[PDB]
Amino acid sequence: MTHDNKLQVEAIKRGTVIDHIPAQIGFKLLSLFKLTETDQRITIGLNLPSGEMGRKDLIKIENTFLSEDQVDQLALYAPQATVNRIDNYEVVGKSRPSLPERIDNVLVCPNSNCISHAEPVSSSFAVRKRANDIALKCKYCEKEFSHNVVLAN
Amino acid sequence: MTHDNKLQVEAIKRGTVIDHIPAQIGFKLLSLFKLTETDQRITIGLNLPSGEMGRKDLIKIENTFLSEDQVDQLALYAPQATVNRIDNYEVVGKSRPSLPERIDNVLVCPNSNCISHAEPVSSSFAVRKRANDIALKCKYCEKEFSHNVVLAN
Amino acid sequence: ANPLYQKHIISINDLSRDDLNLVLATAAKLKANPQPELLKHKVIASCFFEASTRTRLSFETSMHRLGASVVGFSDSANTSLGKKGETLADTISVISTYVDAIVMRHPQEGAARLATEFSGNVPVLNAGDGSNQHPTQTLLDLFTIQQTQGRLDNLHVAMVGDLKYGRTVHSLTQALAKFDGNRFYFIAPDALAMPEYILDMLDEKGIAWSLHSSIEEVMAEVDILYMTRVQKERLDPSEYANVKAQFVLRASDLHNAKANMKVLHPLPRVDEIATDVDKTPHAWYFQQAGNGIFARQALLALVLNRDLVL
Amino acid sequence: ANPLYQKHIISINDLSRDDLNLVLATAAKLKANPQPELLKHKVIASCFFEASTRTRLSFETSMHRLGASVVGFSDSANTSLGKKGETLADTISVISTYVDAIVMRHPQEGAARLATEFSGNVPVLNAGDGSNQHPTQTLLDLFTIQQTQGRLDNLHVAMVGDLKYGRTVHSLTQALAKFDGNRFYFIAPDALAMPEYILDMLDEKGIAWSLHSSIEEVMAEVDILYMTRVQKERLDPSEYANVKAQFVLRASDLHNAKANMKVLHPLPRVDEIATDVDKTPHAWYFQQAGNGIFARQALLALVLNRDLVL
Amino acid sequence: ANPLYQKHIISINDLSRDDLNLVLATAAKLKANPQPELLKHKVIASCFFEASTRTRLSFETSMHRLGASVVGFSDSANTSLGKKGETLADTISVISTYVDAIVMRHPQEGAARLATEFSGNVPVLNAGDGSNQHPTQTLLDLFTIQQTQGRLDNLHVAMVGDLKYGRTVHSLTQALAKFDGNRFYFIAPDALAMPEYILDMLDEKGIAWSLHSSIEEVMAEVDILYMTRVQKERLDPSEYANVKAQFVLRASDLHNAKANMKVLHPLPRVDEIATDVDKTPHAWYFQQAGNGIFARQALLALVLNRDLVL
Ligand SMILES: O=C(O)C[C@H](NC(=O)CP(=O)(O)O)C(=O)O
Ligand SMILES: O=C(O)C[C@H](NC(=O)CP(=O)(O)O)C(=O)O
Ligand SMILES: O=C(O)C[C@H](NC(=O)CP(=O)(O)O)C(=O)O
Ligand SMILES: [Zn+2]
Ligand SMILES: [Zn+2]
């Protein structure tokens, strides 16, 4: 029941469908969260129009199931976005990434003298709604950085 | 003109359509071709099947037609790819990638003592089919490597 | 089993006014009535990977003053970590299988935190990690501050120096924002200013704080003038402009100084506190240092001993 | 305009059989009919970014024997590229606005090819770039083989030593594969063997080559035995096993050798040729070095003289 | 006797407007009417106690283009002043008994002036002494501005970079203040600003100068934009903040620039001029370097030739 305006086939059995990802995100989410490291049928539609959400972006991963854990982790890039849980074609669930209290194994601590860079541990950050932006605090060095400056993988 | 063979298919008026991308290669071309930049309703299908061929990846970028070289540069990364120029929901030209005589900029010479690293110059090797694998020869150091190795840039 | 028993003492941001008041009262009881065997049979690793004269030595005298034994190093150059390429993670993994506690100082931030994820049951005390925290410094500064002002609530506090890399100011500032009414004054070159995270925590907490360009601009309204060394070894090359102290306290600056104001400093000082200050009544750095014995014996007593020392 | 006029001499692979022949033929002429002012009024930059005794002094000597003036540097340390961070591209760019040709020797493979993209009309002459090429060595070696064998075809040539890092043999094999009927025996530690790129060319040309683990096996067959020095300066540390000469030539092993055979070597020799070989009518390495004078004069003439008549 | 005959060229401040004019005019002549033996039989010492690519090789090249012979050292390390403790005074004293002129570049301000007190009739030519002067650079820059602007008056000139340690700009500002109507815009980190001694002269002459914090502000006005390299070798460690180019020139910022404007630079450039500027008809730094040949020939002619007629 996607929409209408000239046809092409496009509906799946079970899986997940991150809907309403803004532009130049979709690529980022596939890379960061490695949502492409699987044999599953993935359909990334970019720029495809959605009113207010003029140039939205979309991704659909078959069989794949996000976790409250995972989903929340998207509020750092595409917060407004809505996760639609489609099971047996029926949209069974529907979340919206709210804010997680800790981001693990994804980011890289900008503090070059942080122990995390040498030892075999997993990076980890506490998320905080600073004022304008979100404030990220390294678990180890205790420094907090603009959620914008903290890099990743 | 018509509707494709397999199920979940996406449509377009004018644009390029790359098909047969081997598995796990689609996302990469999306990186090293800077396709994702262009806000032209891109469509991607990772892990689609591929009849007796297995599973395939494919990209569709409307209003976009590949460079006067990208197909040749697309030859090394995915030889068995097919590049379909689609004008007005129809293929007004289909091509196969040919391996060029030589390749420029995109590759990084594996010989650490090559001067191309240190100096402000463009890399450029000379392609030469060898026995099964292709051999690349650095314009600068004169060494010839297997693309297996060169494709670690 | 007292609140801090078998607990890790990594950062002043994991402790609370109660935890801190727990330590200073113990500090006090211990000073008045020593307990020579309070840690009989314990063996503690003193692992310093960065230099130290007071932290290590006061730490070790403290273990001994309580009957414990000590194993360790003061330089990782001759450790397997230093000559054979071992990770700190493996280091703490093997060490935590010999001793009862690990007191460690390290050149990188978060190294004390890291060791906690690999020490198993053995608690990790942070004798300083890069420019992050220095919690046991904070403990003795509090004890010395209460000793000399009668309290830790509603104090006028000036911190001069390298506030950016001073791990001591990071902890201490956090420790006093846990008390009520304390007022802060900060005097530092603009390149070595208190980090944002601290100024924020202050604002959220409604603590009042202001910058100043002269010690003299606060000399009259302060109870504790906390002097610091420009953490020279931590400066980036592009900061080599602030390697020499800009604010030097000389005796004659203690002229309009409040009668109860003391000059504290975690040491070692270089050129920021002239020697004439040493013999005025406001100089309290060498007593501050000597108070390290008590804040430290108390902490050990609490982490390694179950019942409130009787 | 002779074929060589204003041409860059970067790689034997870019030179043809008749090109090499015109050089040898000219060499021969200069060697008997000295042209003292053939280059009066030119100024050549002799730029060596790496150590040299023979190459640099022979080149400079040839320039002078022909009336050229020379300006240049024997060490990159006191250049602006040395102490100011200048790229090699900009160095070549400005120098080419001063002079007529540039003889350059550099540590990194491809340093010479890159010079051409940056020098305009100024021909660049490769006195060696890393372990890649050294065409001038090859011109003086071809001249030395010609004059002692009376031929450059059907010869049996053994190449002994560091064949991998030896730019000397890389350039000489590609030259000698341009003539007919030559046969090649390669004797080298496996680690330092002949690159594949050169072998494949041999096959592709249908040249007869083969491998041997000793000089003894081939001594009675070769007409020329090219001894080479182990490129200690280039060896990766994993190749450090290969620093001492695996194959050493003593005067006794020349016993079954053809009377007409000459021992050549690019030099410097370290221990691969015991000094008692020096006194055998077989040693030809010092006559081969003097030949550097005549072959490089020829090259400067052919490259800077539109039409030569001697 | 031309005005320049046997004169020491130590500081643009000691040179007059007509002196500079005779050089530019002579430069122009040599650049079209080559005088191959103007200096036959002279021997010039090219003594550089500090690194150089352009200055030394252009100078040496000019000497040769004019028939002079050259003798000298590109490094003070292997001199007797280098390993034996000899003063610079005695070095100049003995060398001046051998040759006709001495081109010297040294690390300490005033090394050239001092040479004169010790060299008798031998003219000394300052190829650079510390951060003080570099008159020959200025002669080749004036020649480059003249030939592209058709004038040396009423020009609008911006000087960007290390103006403080830049002997290049110190000498060029004093020259360009000798002509009329020129206007100066100085763009430099505060730490590395234009010395006061030069500004005061400007005021004293009533020259119009001004300061700007970006190239963008002046791009549309200047006829010449002199980009300069940050003198890393001279920076005191407190200036280490200023090592990276604060003002970088990319091809895009030349968009609103006058068609006749040329980007000059003494070179070597590090990162202050992105390489894409090289392909714009505005970049003139490599043509400016080749100009070193013609201006320094002119100087050697004027200084060693009592009467020149061309
Ligand atoms: O070093 C300083 O300036 C303050 C502080 N000093 C101390 O802890 C005393 P010490 O290093 O002798 O143990 C520190 O951060 O190490
Ligand atoms: O280094 C070698 O032994 C071979 C060869 N030798 C030479 O060119 C002689 P030289 O180093 O003195 O100029 C070289 O490639 O440098
Ligand atoms: O060093 C600079 O960038 C400016 C100036 N540059 C030059 O003279 C060019 P060079 O160092 O190669 O001879 C100098 O004063 O040395
Ligand atoms: Zn961190
Ligand atoms: Zn290469």
- Determine whether E84 is an active site residue: yes
- Determine whether D8 is an active site residue: no
| Cα E195 to the center of its chain, rounded Å | 17
The span from the CA of C135 to the CA of A132, in Å, is 32
What residues of chain C lie within 8 A of the CB of E243, using their CB? 237-238
Contact E131, E166 (CB under 8 A): yes
Q: Which ligand is nearest to the CA of E273?
A: 3
Distances from the Cα of D305 to the Cα of C118, D103, D124, angstroms? 76, 16, 15
Place of tokens 């001694």: E197
Ligand 3 atom with the shortest distance to the CA of E55? 13
CB contact under 8 A, B140 and D117: no
* Catalytic pick among D105, D106, D178, D262: D105
- Determine whether C84 is an active site residue: yes
CA of A67 from ligand 5 middle (Å) equals 47
For residues A53 and A26, membership in a common domain is answered with yes
Place of tokens 């994702």: B36
Burial of A4 (0-12, 13-18, 19+ CB in 10 A): exposed
> Residue B59 in 3-state DSSP?
strand
Last-in-domain residue among B57, B75, B100: B100
For residues A29 and A90, membership in a common domain is answered with yes
For residues B59 and B128, membership in a common domain is answered with no
Residue A64 within any structural domain of the chain: yes
Residues with CB under 6 A from ligand 2: D 52-55, 128, 134, 137, 167-168, 229, 266-268
> Residue E203 in 3-state DSSP?
helix
CB contact under 8 A, C240 and E243: no
Q: Give the DSSP letter of residue E65.
A: H
Residues with CB under 6 A from ligand 1: C 52-55, 128, 134, 137, 167-168, 229, 231, 266-267
To the question of whether residue C167 is assigned a binding role by annotation, the answer is yes
The span from the CA of D229 to the CA of D54, in Å, is 15
Ligand 2 atom with the shortest distance to the CA of D53? 12
Contact B71, B93 (CB under 8 A): no
For residues B59 and B122, membership in a common domain is answered with no
Q: Structurally, how many domains does chain B consist of?
A: 2
Consecutive H or E run containing D291: helix D285-304
For residues A95 and A105, membership in a common domain is answered with no
Contact D50, D111 (CB under 8 A): no
Helices (H) and strands (E) in chain D, counts: 9, 9
Chains D and B touch (3+ CB pairs under 8 A): yes
Place of tokens 């320039």: D63
Q: Helices E135-149 and E285-304 meet at what angle, rounded to 10?
A: 120
* Catalytic pick among C42, C134, C178, C296: C134
Q: Give the DSSP letter of residue D53.
A: S
| Cα D268 to the center of its chain, rounded Å | 13
> Residue D266 in 3-state DSSP?
coil
For residues B22 and B93, membership in a common domain is answered with yes
Residue B67 within any structural domain of the chain: yes
Contact D108, B113 (CB under 8 A): yes
What residues of chain B lie within 8 A of the CB of A64, using their CB? none
Using CB atoms, list chains with 3+ pairs below 8 Å to chain A.
Answer: B, C
Assigned token pair, E134: 């570099």
Number of B to D CB contacts under 8 A, please give it. 58
Contact E116, E10 (CB under 8 A): yes
Chains E and D touch (3+ CB pairs under 8 A): yes
* Catalytic pick among E55, E91, E136, E138: E55
Dihedral over Cα of D268, D272, D278, D280: its sign: negative
CA of D252 from ligand 3 middle (Å) equals 58
Residue A58 within any structural domain of the chain: yes
Residue A3 within any structural domain of the chain: no
| Helical segments of chain E, H only | 17-30, 54-65, 80-83, 88-95, 111-118, 135-149, 167-176, 196-205, 285-304
| Helical segments of D44-118, H only | 54-65, 80-83, 88-95, 111-118
To the question of whether residue B40 is assigned a binding role by annotation, the answer is no
The span from the CA of E23 to the CA of A151, in Å, is 58
Consecutive H or E run containing A85: strand A82-87
For residues B125 and B92, membership in a common domain is answered with no
CA of A108 from ligand 4 middle (Å) equals 8
CB contact under 8 A, E53 and D83: no
Ligand 5 (ion): residues with CB under 5 Å are B 109, 111, 114, 138, 140-141
* Ligand 1, pocket-test mutation among C47, C52, C243, C269, most atoms within 8 A of CB: C52
How were these coordinates obtained? X-ray
* Ligand 2, pocket-test mutation among D47, D55, D58, D169, most atoms within 8 A of CB: D55
Residue B111 within any structural domain of the chain: yes
- Ligand 2, atom 8, residue with closest C-alpha: D55
For residues A71 and A125, membership in a common domain is answered with no
Q: Give the DSSP letter of residue B16.
A: E
Q: Which of C190, C235, C238, C243 to mutate to test the interface with E (most CBs of E within 10 A)?
A: C238
Distances from the Cα of D248 to the Cα of B119, D229, D268, angstroms? 40, 10, 14
B20 touches chain D (CB under 8 A): no
- Determine whether D26 is an active site residue: no
For residues B111 and B73, membership in a common domain is answered with no
The CATH number assigned to the domain holding B147 equals 2.30.30.20
For residues A71 and A34, membership in a common domain is answered with yes
Assigned token pair, B123: 């890399």
Last-in-domain residue among A77, A100, A123: A100
Distances from the Cα of C192 to the Cα of C186, C188, E6, E130, E181, angstroms? 11, 6, 57, 33, 46
E183-187 β-sheet, strand order: E208-211, E183-187, E156-160, E224-227, E262-264
- Determine whether C8 is an active site residue: no
Q: Which of E202-219 are b and which e, b meaning 16 or more Cβ less than 10 Å from the residue's Cβ?
A: beeeebebeebeebeebb
Residues 6+ apart with CB under 8 A from C290: none
Q: Of E10, E262, E19, nearest to E141 (Cα)?
A: E262
The span from the CA of B105 to the CA of B120, in Å, is 11
For residues B89 and B147, membership in a common domain is answered with no
Distances from the Cα of C58 to the Cα of A53, C63, C292, angstroms? 64, 9, 6
Distances from the Cα of D23 to the Cα of C76, D139, D248, E270, angstroms? 64, 7, 33, 41
Ligand 2 atom with the shortest distance to the CA of D51? 11
Query: Omega into D268 within 30° of 0, i.e. cis?
Result: yes
Amino acid at D54: R
Q: Which of D93-108 are b and which e, b meaning 16 or more Cβ less than 10 Å from the residue's Cβ?
A: bbbbbbbbbbbbbbbb
Q: Give the DSSP letter of residue B97.
A: P
Q: Give the DSSP letter of residue B110.
A: S
Dihedral over Cα of C243, C246, C252, C253: its sign: negative
The span from the CA of E146 to the CA of B98, in Å, is 54
Assigned token pair, E164: 């403080």
Contact D76, D84 (CB under 8 A): no
Q: Which of C219-251 are b and which e, b meaning 16 or more Cβ less than 10 Å from the residue's Cβ?
A: beebbbbbbbbbbeebbeeebbbbeebebbbee
Assigned token pair, A56: 């939205």
Domain that holds residue A135: 101-153
The span from the CA of D300 to the CA of D289, in Å, is 17
* Catalytic pick among E42, E65, E106, E134: E134
* Catalytic pick among E54, E113, E183, E258: E54
Q: Of C137, C158, C162, nearest to C231 (Cα)?
A: C162
Side-chain-side CA neighbours of residue B153 (13 Å): 15
Residues 6+ apart with CB under 8 A from A100: A69, A72, A73, A75, A76, A127
The span from the CA of D188 to the CA of D195, in Å, is 11
Number of C to E CB contacts under 8 A, please give it. 16
CB contact under 8 A, C111 and A115: yes
To the question of whether residue B138 is assigned a binding role by annotation, the answer is yes
Place of tokens 């007004």: B92
Contact C48, C104 (CB under 8 A): yes
Residue A1 within any structural domain of the chain: no
Q: Of A146, A150, A147, nearest to A123 (Cα)?
A: A150
3-state secondary structure chain C: CCCCCCCCECCCCCCCHHHHHHHHHHHHHHHHCCCCCCCCCCEEEEEECCCCCHHHHHHHHHHHHCCCEEEEECCHHHCHHHHHCCCHHHHHHHHCCCCCEEEEEECCECHHHHHHCCCCCCCEEEEEECCCCCHHHHHHHHHHHHHHHCCCCCCEEEEECCCCCCHHHHHHHHHHCCCCCCEEEEECCHHHCCCHHHHHHHHHCCCCEEECCCHHHCHHHCCEEEECCCCCCCCCHHHHHHCCCCCCECHHHHCCCCCCCEEECCCCCCCCECHHHHHCCCECHHHHHHCHHHHHHHHHHHHHCCCCCC
Residue A151 within any structural domain of the chain: yes
For residues A19 and A55, membership in a common domain is answered with yes
Ligand 4 (ion): residues with CB under 5 Å are A 109, 111, 114, 138, 140-141
Q: Of C109, C68, C85, nearest to C296 (Cα)?
A: C68
To the question of whether residue C234 is assigned a binding role by annotation, the answer is no
Ligand 3 atom with the shortest distance to the CA of E53? 12
Q: Which ligand is nearest to the CA of D85?
A: 3
The span from the CA of A58 to the CA of A56, in Å, is 7
Q: How many other CB atoms are found less than 10 A from the CB of residue E149?
A: 17
Last-in-domain residue among A81, A100, A119: A100
Q: Of C215, C206, C219, C170, nearest to C188 (Cα)?
A: C215
E35 touches chain D (CB under 8 A): no
Beta bridge partner(s), residue D73 = D47
Residues 6+ apart with CB under 8 A from C268: C53, C229
Dihedral over Cα of C168, C169, C174, C176: its sign: positive
| Cα C100 to the center of its chain, rounded Å | 22
Q: Where are the beta strands (DSSP E) in chain B?
A: 15-21, 42-50, 54-62, 82-86, 91-95, 102-104, 124-129, 134-138, 144-146
Identify which of A120, A137, A140 has the shortest CB distance to residue C89. Answer: A120
For chain C, the distance separating the N- and C-terminal CA atoms, rounded to the nearest angstrom, is: 13
What domains can you pick out in chain D, each with its CATH number? Answer: 1-133+292-310 (3.40.50.1370), 134-291 (3.40.50.1370)
Residue B3 within any structural domain of the chain: no
The span from the CA of C285 to the CA of A8, in Å, is 79
The span from the CA of D156 to the CA of D209, in Å, is 10
To the question of whether residue B140 is assigned a binding role by annotation, the answer is no
| Cα E99 to the center of its chain, rounded Å | 24
Torsion of CA E102, E107, E108, E111, to 10 degrees: 0
Contact C222, C258 (CB under 8 A): yes
> Residue A103 in 3-state DSSP?
strand
Resolution (in Å) of the shown entry? 2.1
